[PDB]
Amino acid sequence: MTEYKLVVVGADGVGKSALTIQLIQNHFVDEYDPTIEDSYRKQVVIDGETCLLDILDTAGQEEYSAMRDQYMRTGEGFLCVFAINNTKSFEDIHHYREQIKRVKDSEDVPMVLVGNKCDLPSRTVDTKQAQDLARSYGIPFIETSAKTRQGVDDAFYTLVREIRKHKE
Ligand SMILES: Cc1cccc2cccc(N3CCc4c(nc(OC[C@@H]5CCCN5C)nc4N4CCNC[C@H]4C)C3)c12
Ligand SMILES: Nc1nc2c(ncn2[C@@H]2O[C@H](COP(=O)(O)OP(=O)(O)O)[C@@H](O)[C@H]2O)c(=O)[nH]1
Ligand SMILES: [Mg+2]
């Protein structure tokens, strides 16, 4: 089977952990320790390919040490997550994409832009705004809810698909 190393990044509170746990463990966590960073592995079939997904759920403090830089650059693809009711988290996307380009030392890194919490009633980030940002980057965009599980499998599988085509 093919191993894929995925890294879920984005501002605190956007739902990186809920998204990962929903995909790995099939349940919605409401109060996952905001500081716990860990890797999770899941065997799954994507487009008929058996895949082992190694998924780094990032957390902790905004540090830029050489060890963290090294942990991140093992990512083959990146889920860049913001929440549709958190303007600041959307604005922060550019920064995360810049940090990815830096530690990977490349301007084409497989990435998917993810607008989480789409179950929530009053969003301040419009679908169009985020699509526009995605198309500027050349990356896919998907809306997700870690609560209802909408889009969750597709967000991760779509990232896997972006890694395949980068590998040609
Ligand atoms: C994420 C990432 C990807 C690829 C390579 C990296 C290399 C080094 C460090 C990384 N990370 C570490 C965690 C982190 C990072 N950048 C911000 O930016 C917060 C705000 C907004 C813009 C500037 N800054 C002021 N915040 C963070 N953390 C806030 C507190 N909890 C967890 C975490 C989300 C950057 C790399
Ligand atoms: N309503 C709703 N709440 C969510 C969703 N995803 C995460 N949350 C909640 O938002 C908070 C932060 O989620 P968490 O996964 O810890 O964010 P992280 O800092 O990105 O890991 C928690 O209270 C979650 O229960 C979602 O899709 N919808
Ligand atoms: Mg978390």
Residue numbers in the entry: 1 to 168
Sentences from the paper on this structure:
The oncogenic impacts of the KRAS gene were first reported in 1980s, making KRAS one of the first identified oncogenes. It is known that KRAS protein functions as a molecular switch: it responds to upstream EGFR activation and regulates the downstream MAPK and PI3K/mTOR pathways, eventually controlling cell proliferation, differentiation, and survival.
Further chemical exploration focusing on piperazine substitution yielded TH-Z816 (wherein the piperazine was (R)-methyl-substituted), which had relatively strong inhibition activity (IC50 = 14 μM). Indeed, the detected binding affinity (KD) of TH-Z816 with KRAS(G12D) (GDP-bound) was 25.8 μM. Note that the pocket shape was quite similar (RMSD 0.293 Å, 148 to 148 atoms) to the MRTX-induced SII-P of KRAS(G12C). Specifically, the naphthyl moiety of TH-Z816 embedded deeply into the pocket and formed hydrophobic interactions with residues Val9, Met72, Phe78, Gln99, Ile100, and Val103. There are also four pairs of polar interactions between TH-Z816 and residues His95, Glu62, Gly60, and Asp12. Note that an ionic bond and a hydrogen bond together comprise the anticipated salt-bridge: on one hand, the positively charged piperazine moiety of TH-Z816 and negatively charged side chain of Asp12 are close enough to support an ionic bond; on the other hand, the measured bond angle (166.7°) and length (2.7 Å) supports the presence of a hydrogen bond between these two moieties.
